[model samples]
Target chain A: DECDGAIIGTAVKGHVAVHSDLSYWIESRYNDTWKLERAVFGEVKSCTWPETHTLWGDDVEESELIIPHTIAGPKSKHNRREGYKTQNQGPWDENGIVLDFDYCPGTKVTITEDCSKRGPSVRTTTDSGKLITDWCCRSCSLPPLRFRTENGCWYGMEIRPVMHDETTLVRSQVDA
Target chain B: DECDGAIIGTAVKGHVAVHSDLSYWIESRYNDTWKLERAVFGEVKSCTWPETHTLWGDDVEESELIIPHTIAGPKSKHNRREGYKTQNQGPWDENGIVLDFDYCPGTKVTITEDCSKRGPSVRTTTDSGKLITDWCCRSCSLPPLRFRTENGCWYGMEIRPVMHDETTLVRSQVDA
Candidate 1:
C-alpha cells in the first residue's frame, strides 16, 4: 500500500496530573530543554474521590486559582461542597504561577496543557520533576515532596497534559 | 480518729515527665490581681504529631515556673502509637485533635481517660468530658482550602494544667 501524506500538521493536547491527596494549583512555562510547555487552568470537576479523604480549608474562595477535584462526593448534581475554582496561576504572579496543594497524600490533580485547549497538550507532574534549564526558581521548592505527607506544599507542581490519559494535540507552548 | 490541719509553706522542687511523643510548653506569672509584678516565660515544648497511628516528632526544654505538674508528651503511649509514654486516650488534644473511626466505622475511638506513672504530670484529655471539642471543624463535605489538614501551626491540645486550660483564666498577671 502506498502512503498518502499531506501538509496537514499533527498536534498533541498535553495534560499534567497532580498526584497528592491534597489539592493544588500552579503556573508554569515551557521548559525548552525538555520541550514541555506549561498548562492553562480549567474547570473544577464536580466530583470528589475517596469520599472525604481530603479536607479543604475555608480560606480558598471562588475564582482564586483554587480548584477542587476528589475521588469522593455525592454522585448527584446538587453536591456543591465538592470543589471550587478561582483565578489563574499566572499574571497574578511574577516569577510564574502560584501552586497551592491541599496536602492530602496520593490525590490526583490535572490541568489543560494548552493555553486554551487550542494546540498541543503535554503531561507532567505539577511540581515533582527534575529541573529543566527551563526551570523557574521564583517560588520553587527543594525537591519533589511526598504525596499526602505533611509539608503539604512540599512539591508545588503545575498540571500539564500527558500522552496516555487522553488523546489530544500538541503545539508550541511555554514552561509548565 | 483525730484530725490535725495546718497551712505549711515551703519551697518545693517539682519535676516534669517529658514524653517523646507530645508537644508542650509553659508560662507563668506571680499575680496578686489588683496590683502586682512578676512574669516569666517558662519552658517550651514543640512537637509534630504525625498522621500515622503513633509516629510523631516532639521536643521539650525545661525552664522555671512556680510549680509545674505532669510532663509534656503523648499520654496514652499505647494505641496512639505502640511504644513508650503509652496512655489510653492518646494525648489530650480534643480540639482539632482527630480520630478516624469513620475510616473504620462501627468502631468507637477506644476510650482512654489517661495514664501516668511518675513525676508531677500535667493534665491530659482525660480531664475533658465526653463532649470533647473537635477543636477543628470536620464536615462530611469540604469547602475551598488552600492548605492541607496538617499544614501550618498544627496542634493537639488537652487539659494538662487545670489553670492553663481553664476558661476563667483568660489572661494572667504578676504579684507586687
Candidate 2:
C-alpha cells in the first residue's frame, strides 16, 4: 500500500495516512487488517457543523477537529494537568483539571472546583458526548473534548459550550 | 550554550549535551542554573569498573551506560510491559514484570510470579541499588536498572547480575 499524501498526526496512535482530498485513515501494522481497519474511519464519521448546529441551535458554535502534536501509540499514556480561573472569581474559585489517559483506552477527566470546600469530581468516558460536557465546565477555559478510539480506529473530537449560556464564549485555533 | 558534539539520548529527559572528549552533561533550560546544574553531573559521576571490581571482586562484570532514543520531557511518563521466558522454566513458573515511571520522578517496579496462587510483588524506589536487584529477578531477562535523578541532574545507570551463580551470565549490547 502507498500513501498518496503526507501522514498527519492524531490524538491517538501518533499518525494517520492522509490522501490528496484531505480525508485520512488509520494505518495498520498488520497487512491483512489494513483495508478493514481503514474502513472504520468512514463508518464512524464525526458529526459536522450541520449536526451540531441543529442540536443546540444558535446557542452553540461548532469548532473543527483538533489534532494535537503529542501523539501516543497503542501502548502509550498521557496526563495533562492545568489550572483554570475566571475573571473576578475568588481564590477559592480556582479550578484544577486533570486529564489522565491510560494506554489510550479512555481518559479519566477530573475537575476540582472550590478547592477549599469540595473534592474533585471525576468522570471517565470512552465516548465524545458526555466527555465534552464534563470538560466544558461553565467557564469554557479548557480546550475541546478529545476522544480516543480503539487501536486502528478513527479518532475525532468536538467542541461546544456545555451550559449553552450567552455569557460564555469558546474559541479554538489550530496550531501548525 | 553550544554543544561541541551531538546531543545523546538519556533514560530520563531524553537528550544530553556531549563534549568532543567523550564527556557529557545534562542540559538545563534555566540560564541562571545552567552552569551549576551541569556541574552536578561531574560531582555525582556513576561508579566505574574499578569501584565495582573492588566491591564484588570477580563476581561483577560492569557494562556501559545505555541511552534509549525514547526521551520524555519534565512532564513525561513511561511504562514498559514485555513478556519473558527461560529455556527450561515451566509454564507455571512464568513471571511477569512491570516498570512504570511516573513523571520521571521514580519507577514503581512490580514482579508477578506463579500467577496460579501468589500475588504480584511490588517495589517502588528512586535509587539504583535495589531496583537493579529487583529487576534482575534471578533469570536476568530485563535490561539494567535505570535511575531518574532530579530534573536537570545527571542520569546514569549500571547493569550487572544480582546473583553471582556461575550458571548465570549477563551480556549487554548498544544499539545506535
Candidate 3:
C-alpha cells in the first residue's frame, strides 16, 4: 500500500447497447454487460520499489510492464465505424480508463487464493529467491510492488511480461 | 490468416522524463532512454479475426489492433513526484497518442514467426493441433488482415485474449 495507490470504486456502469470487454462486467438484471467506470477514485498514498535487480526492480520497472493494460474487445456502439481515431475516441479508452498502480515485474504478491483481499497480498524475495520484504510491509506480508493495488478493481491494470520480443530483459538491467 | 487481426505501426516517439506506466517506450539514440510518442499516426486500414470461443472474437474488434503499445516506465526527468493522475497527464497520453485501427477478437491472424513483420502473416484453422495458415499468402503473403498497415512505425498494437472473467463472446455477434 506504500505505492500510495488505492483501489478506486466507481458507481459508473456500462451504457445501453454498448458492447463491453474483458475488463467490463455484466449486469445481472439487465442481462447485459456493463462497463466498469471510475465510480470514485483513490490515490497512490505512497510506493517503494525493491533494489536494482530483484523481481520488479530497475529492469522490469523500465520494461513494458509499466504501461497500463486493458484487455482487447469488440467495437462499442459509439465508434464501431470504419476508420482510425486517436485514443480519445478508441472503444476501450473511454470505459477502460487506466488505474495507475505502481508495481514491478517478478514481484510475488500474497493475496487470497482468488486475490479478493489486499492488506495481506504483497510478497517478494531477493535475487537469490529468498523470502524478503525490504521496502514492503512485513506484518500483513505485502511487498512494495504496486501491481496488485488494482486487484479488486473491475477494469484493473496489468503489467504482463513482454512475450512478443527481446525487450523483456530491459526489465531488470543490472542483474539480468 | 483466419483470425483477421494483425499488428499495425504508427509514427510516434517521445522525449522528456516522467513516471510512466502501462503504455510507454524507451528511446533509442539517447541511449539513456526516452518515451516513444505517437509520432506519425496511421490506421490498420484493415484486419481480420478467426473463429468463435477463441480470445479475440465476439467481444473484441479489429480496429483496436491498430493502436500501438509501450511499456510504462519510471518517472522521466520531469513528473517524477506525484500521487494519482488520469491518462491525460500520463506520459503515453501526451505524445503517446492513440492511432485507431480495425480488428476483432478470437479471429485467426497471420503475424510473423516472431510477429515482427506483417503483409503475409495471416494463418489459422479450427482450434487444431499445431498452428498453421491456410488462406494466407505463404511467401510474402499479405492477407486481408490490416493489422500492420502502419509498419516500421515506432510502437505497435496487438489483439490479445480476454482472460479477466466471463463475458468473452461478444466480439462476433454480426461483424467480422
Candidate 4:
C-alpha cells in the first residue's frame, strides 16, 4: 500500500494536505468564495473553485477545517515533472527550482516583493532560504494574479490589496 | 528513495534491524558463537555465523550491539515472497502464514511448544495471537534444529536445552 498523506501544515484560514510526493493542496476561502489551491515546490499550480460549495465563513468550524487524505495530487503526466530547467540565456540566468524531497523539519521559508532591478517581482526561497527564485507578474492584475517563475513556470495567487493584509501567509501546525 | 529502516526492537542480548519490507535480522551471540539470524513473520529463515567474528560475550558491549541499517534482507528473488500458501490437503489443514505489514504497535506475540498433538511442535501466532501456525521438528537433533511449518516452509533456530532458558525470546525496544 502507498504511504498515507501527512498533514504538515495549513494555509491562511485553510488546511493543507501533503502527499508522499511532497505535492500538496490548500483549502481556504476568500470573501464568499471557497477556494482550493494545489501547490508544489512552495508555489500555487492550480485553483479549484467548487461549484456547489458555499463559504465556510471566518468562524473556522472544526468540521470544515479537516482536509481529507483522499485529496489527490495532479493527474496530468506533465504536471508531475520532478524539476524544471531553462535553455535560453536570460539576464537573471540560474538553475531553476529543484525539488528537495528530503527537506528537514523547521526549515524557514520566506516570501517577499522585489521592485529593485526590473520592476515588481515576487522572490521565494527554499532549502532554508539558501536558493532564491524570482517571479514576475505579466499584466499586473488585481488579487488572483498570474505569475511566472524565473524558469518560466506558471502559477497563480490571491492576495489582499492593502499593505497590512497584502501577504496572506500561514504558519505550520505543531503536533497536530 | 525508499523509507529509512526503523529500529523497532532488539533480540535477546542481540540487536534487530527492521526494514521497510518488514523483513529483519537479529545479531546475537550464543555462548562462544556469534550468529546473525534473518527472520520474517517471526520465524527464523536463515542464520549466518560470521567467519572471522568471535563471541561478543555476556557483558554486551555498546559498539557490538549496534546493528547497522545496511544489513540487507534475503538477496534471492523467491525468498522475498510476500506470503505463502498451501496446496496439498493435510490433517492440519489451514491457510499458511500471511504477512501483516500494517501491524499495530504493542501487539502481543507468543511462542510456545505444543506436545499434545501427534508429537512435539512449535506454534507461533501473528496479528496479536489471533492466527496460529504449527511447526514440527524433523529428526530433532541438537540445539540448532531444522523445522518445517505446517505449510512446509523450512526454518532454523538455536535454543537452550534446559527448560528455564529453553526459549530465547526478545522484547521490543521502547522509544529507542
- When 2 and 4 are scored with TM-score, the better candidate is 2
State the lDDT of candidate 2 residue by residue for A1-176, as single tens digits: 22211222222232322111112222222233211011111111122212211111233211211211111111111111122211111111111111111211222223344223211222232233232232323222233232222111111121122333333222212221
Local accuracy of candidate 3 as per-residue lDDT tens digits, B20-133: 111221111122442122111111112222232122123422222222112212122221111111121111222112221222112343433433322212212122222222
Q: Name the runs in model 4 displaced over 4 angstroms.
A: A1-176, B1-21, B25-27, B42-147, B153-176
* Sliding window of 10 residues with minimal summed lDDT for model 2 chain A: A86-95
| Interface RMSD per candidate | 25.8, 19.2, 12.4, 16.1
Looking at candidate 4 chain B, the ten consecutive residues that score lowest on lDDT are: B82-91
Q: Which docking band does candidate 4 fall into? A: incorrect
* Candidate 1 lDDT over residue span B17-72, tens digit each: 11111111111112221110111111122332222222112332211111111222
Residue-level lDDT of model 3, residues A1-176, one tens digit each, is: 11211211112243433211112211111224222111101111112311221111222212222121122111222211111111111112121122212333323333333333212122232233332322222122222222111111111111112122222111111111
Better of 3 and 4 by DockQ: 3
Residue A42 of model 4 has an lDDT of 22
The worst-scoring run of ten residues by lDDT in candidate 3 chain A lies at: A37-46
Per-residue lDDT of A25 in model 3: 19
Candidate 2 achieves a global lDDT of: 0.20
lDDT of 1 by residue, A39-111 (tens): 1111122233332222232453333222222211211121121122221221221111223323222233333
Higher lDDT: candidate 2 or 3? 3
Which segments of candidate 2 are over 4 A away from where they belong?
A1-62, A68-176, B1-62, B68-176
- What is the DockQ (computed on Cα atoms) for candidate 3? 0.04
Chain A TM-score, structure 2: 0.18
lDDT of each: 0.21, 0.20, 0.21, 0.23
